[PDB]
Design a protein around this ligand. Structure first.
Ligand SMILES: Cc1cc([C@@H]2CCCN2S(C)(=O)=O)no1
Length: 93
């Protein structure tokens, strides 16, 4: 049975106006800015951008990859597909 989301989990994350996007739940470094309540820090592969999202916009990657893991015209998306498949827990800083 599913647990709550935790740092390191792999997802497709949905933002308004963008396709479901390969991403991970990030940790928060000591001294770093914390997300709002009920929000997680999402790192988006390919773009390497961070936004704060709740579970309604988070699709676990294993279940969802057949549907959402296909190339997209959008900037950074196909780099992002490589990262989530090949080195999803690397430093991209
Ligand atoms: C992670 C992380 C944060 C830091 C900074 C700089 C030195 C002390 N800290 S802090 C202000 O206590 O977060 N080092 O590693």
């Amino acid at each position: 049975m599913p647990h709550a989301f935790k740092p390191g989990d792999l997802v497709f994350a949905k933002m308004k106006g963008y396709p479901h996007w390969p991403a991970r739940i990030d940790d928060i470094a000591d001294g770093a800015v914390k997300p709002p309540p009920n929000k997680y820090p999402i790192f988006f592969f390919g773009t390497h951008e961070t936004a704060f999202l709740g579970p309604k916009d988070l699709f676990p990657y294993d279940k969802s990859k057949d549907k959402y893991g296909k190339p997209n015209k959008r900037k950074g998306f196909n780099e992002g597909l490589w990262e989530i498949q090949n080195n999803p827990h690397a430093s991209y800083s």
